[PDB]
Amino acid sequence: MNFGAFSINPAMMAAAQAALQSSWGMMGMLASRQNQSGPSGNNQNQGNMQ
Incomplete structure (x- = not known):
């Protein structure tokens, strides 16, 4: 049923790089x-000498 539909857009990984x-x-x-x-x-x- 997951025809690439439940693919989550990266955010934590996106922020990590920034x-x-x-x-x-x-x-x-x-x-x-x-x-x-x-x-x-x-x-x-x-x-x-000090």
């Missing part, structure tokens, strides 16, 4: 973990 847009792709000032190109941070203690 939720990815909020999952990642965040703004830089919101994600405090910023990357640096090279050892410019200087974590060495030798040469560090």
